[PDB]
Structure formats: structure tokens, C-alpha cells
Structure 1
């Protein structure tokens, strides 16, 4: 039906397999700290799996009028990210034993990032969609700022090493989302929805399963 269906189907399959792999791999783990990381990390692709399935079956898709056309908007992505992005930030924060204040700042700014992105995606006045994109981007920039300038002296080498790798993976991949949104169907519409869907699938799988494989294979998750 929809040309982007193949990418949604592949996304569903990859998130599903990733979830199952992490689920199996986490069996037997008794270390409290490691359990936290496995729980957070397995839940991420499990949620993504449900939302990709939602998009594939057509439930997480809605039509938004703007620019004089009926624009297909997959709102299920925000329902996904609303829960998965904060969880991913939690993995990074727990890894460096961040204090509660910083965790709340990250989670709250993340909520603002996704919430304003959702508002922008459903906004009927074309020009306003970009106002929301700008605010969401400012929130993302705040998050990236905190990750880099927001624990070193008393920090295990493996912890510092894995955190630096996951932080770099996060900054690169997350930074791409606003660009894809901006040039894709939710924004300027210069890149067709099918290609946009492919881009998000690669980004999502990398930011979730890729990110997860790196974290769960590290000894940093253990006390």
C-alpha cells in the first residue's frame, strides 16, 4: 500500500530481534547494577518494536492538513521517543553515576524536546511547525550540552571509556533526527516520506540496538 511499508516492516523485525537478543543475553544476570542496564536497554527496542508495528499496520499514522495538502504524519514515532529517549539518557546518566538533579534536567528537557516535536508534527499552520522544531532543537542542544559539560576523578576507566563511546554515538545519531524532520514530510517536504522512513529506521535501529550492543557488551555495566 504505502511505499515506506518495507522500511517499517524491517524496522519492526530488527527491533523485535534486538529485544529478544537482549532479553536472552540478560538472563542469569544477578548483579544489581547490570540488571538496571539490561532492563533499560531491553525495554527501549521493545517499545520501538510496538510503535514500528503500529506504523506498519497503519494505526500510528494520521493525516494533518497544511500547505494545502493532506500530509501523512506518523505520530507513533513520538509515542515511541517519549519513552525511549529518556530511557537512553538514563543509561548514560547511570553509567556515570549522575546526581538526581542532572537526571531530572535531562529527562525533563527530553520530554520537552519530544513534546514540542509532536506539537510541530500535528500543527496545521505551516510556518508554526518550524517554530516548534526550533524549540525542540534548542532542547536537544541543551541535552547535548549537559552530556558534554554536565564525576571524572572518581570514575572507573571502563566506565569513562564506554560512556565516551556511547556519548559520541548519541550526539551524532540524535543530531540527525532534526535534520531529517526538517527536510522530510513533517517539514519542508523536499525528501519523500519513503526515504524519510528509511532514514529514521537506520537511525532508530542504530541508536537503540547498536547503542544497546555496545553498552551490554561492556564491563562498565557491572559493579
Structure 2
């Protein structure tokens, strides 16, 4: 395990996701409100899935070698397995907060699936120049998602409770900033142009992942917006 310099960040990531999972699990024990239960379920599952995939990367299972540029390049494929399930759960948290219509939710989840799926294909593609074609398609799917979060959701939040409108606005802003960093790190890291070494890349993704999951969850689950308006 320690044979890879990036192991320290995989281990820290595993620990922080594990701790985040346990914290949300305990916190949600005292919850009976049916609406709050939905948000706790979604939000606890996110770091639990990430915990398993960080562990698989730490132990070496979630790593494969991909030939491109005349080299055997270490590619952590387990990231995409994580993201396939956790990024639509994160979007679902946002969509339920603002009572999004079903068509909009399906558009978001579908675009998200395309985003992660094409990122996976790009990560595993052996023809170097083609990796960036997949990156571009994935990034276009991301831009669609960000567009919807701003010009379909923000003006939906404003007709809702003030506490859900303010909580949505904060989580929207956190999401757009954090999620936009992922394609940049991929592009300059070992999957793309290879300018930033894998150990630093792994650190960067770990900070983004913990912030986008445990950070996000801490903000959401401390808000009164997750509860039905009750006396």
C-alpha cells in the first residue's frame, strides 16, 4: 500500500468519509419527520459509497494501468464508480429541496450519467488525442447541469419557503464552484496532459470530494429546510 506516494491522501480520504458517514448516521437517529428522513438517507449514503471506493483505491483494487503516450499510466477507475452513484444523489438533494418537477430531475440525472460515463470512457481510452474528445463531451454535460441549477432551480427556490431558498442558494453556490474544479484537475492531471503529478492530483480530488460530500452534507443537515413546516 505504502509503495504508492499518493497512499497518504487515499488513507486520509477513507478516514474522513468513514467519519462523515458515522456522524450523519448518528445524527439522523433522532429523526421521524418523513421529509427529513429523505434528506438524511440521501446524504448519509453519499459518503458511505465514497468510503468504500476510497478504500478500494487504498488497497489497490480500484486502480488499473492504461497504455497511452507510450507509457503504462496508473488510472484510478474507482472514482467513476463512486461518482456514478454519488453525483446523482447530490443532485437529488438539491432537486428535492426546491420540489423540482419530475422531468427536470430526469434531465439532471441523465445528463449527470452522461457526464460520468463519458469521463470514464475518456479515462480508459488508449488513443491519447481521443481522451480529450470525451473530456469535452463530459464537460458539455456538466455545463448543462450547471445551467439548470441556475436558470431552472434558483427561480424555483424563490417561490418556496425562505429557509429552503436560502439553504438552496448556499448549496447551489458550493456545488457550482466545487464541481467545476473536477474537469480542470482531470485535464492537467495524470488522466489528461500530465502536468500535475498523480500524488498532487490525488490530494486535490480528496479535498474536493470531502468538501463536496461531507462539507455539503454538514450545511444541508443543519438546516431547518429539510423539515416539513410543522407546528
After TM superposition, the score normalised by the length of structure 1 is 0.99
CA contact 2:40–2:221 (8 Å) conserved in 1? yes
Following superposition, the deviation at residue 28 of structure 1 comes to: 1.9
TM-aligned CA deviation for residue 153 of structure 1: 5.3
- Displacement, 1:145? 0.2
Query: Deviations 1:62-89 (Å, cap 9, x if unpaired)?
Result: 0000000000000000000000000000
CA contact (8 A) 2:157 2:168 kept: no
Q: Structure 2 vs 1, CA of residues 152 and 76 (structure 1 numbering), >3 Å: closer, same or farther?
A: closer
1:220 matched to 2:225? The reply is yes
Question: What SS does structure 2 have at the residue aligned with 1:64?
Answer: strand
Runs of 4+ in structure 1 deviating by more than 3 angstroms, as ranges, are: none
Question: Residue 72 of structure 1 aligns to a residue in which SS?
Answer: strand
Distance 1:152 1:177 in 2: 26
Preserved contact between residue 66 and residue 72 of structure 2 (Cα < 8 Å): yes
Number of matched pairs: 223
CA distance in 1, matches of 2:98, 2:193: 39
Q: Distance in 2 between matches of 1:171 and 1:153?
A: 18
Q: 8 Å contact 2:139–2:183 — kept in the other structure?
A: yes
Q: Indicate if the aligned counterparts of 2:157 and 2:164 stay in contact, CA closer than 8 A.
A: no
Quickly say closer, same or farther: Cα 1:161–1:2, change in 2 above 3 A.
same
Deviation digits for residues 187-215 of structure 1 (CA, Å, limit 9, x no counterpart): 00000000000000000000000000000
Contact 2:10/2:54 (8 A) holds in 1 = yes
Show structure 2 runs of 5+ residues with no match.
Answer: none
Q: Are the aligned partners of 2:36 and 2:226 in contact in 1 as well (CA < 8 Å)? A: yes
SS of residue paired to 2:67:
strand
How far, CA to CA, are the matches of 2:81 and 2:55 in structure 1?
13
Distance in 1 between the 2:190 and 2:97 partners? 36
Query: C-alpha offsets along residues 131-165 of structure 1, whole Å, 9 cap, x if unaligned?
Result: 00000000000000000001345300000000000
1:72-120 deviation per Cα after TM superposition (whole angstroms, max 9, x unaligned):
0000000000000000000000000000000000000000000000000
In 2, distance between residues paired with 1:37 and 1:106? 18
| d(CA) in 1 for partners of 2:66, 2:194 | 13
* Residue 202 of structure 1: aligned partner: 207
Match of 1:30 in 2: 32
SS in 2 for 1:214: helix
Partner SS for 2:157: coil
Query: Which whole-Å CA distance do the structure 2 matches of 1:153 and 1:124 have between them?
Result: 47
2:64 is paired with a residue of what secondary structure? strand
The 1:153–1:14 alpha-carbon spacing in structure 2 relative to 1, beyond 3 Å, is: closer
Query: Which stretches in structure 1 are left out of the alignment for 5+ residues?
Result: none
Q: Secondary structure at the match of 1:115?
A: helix
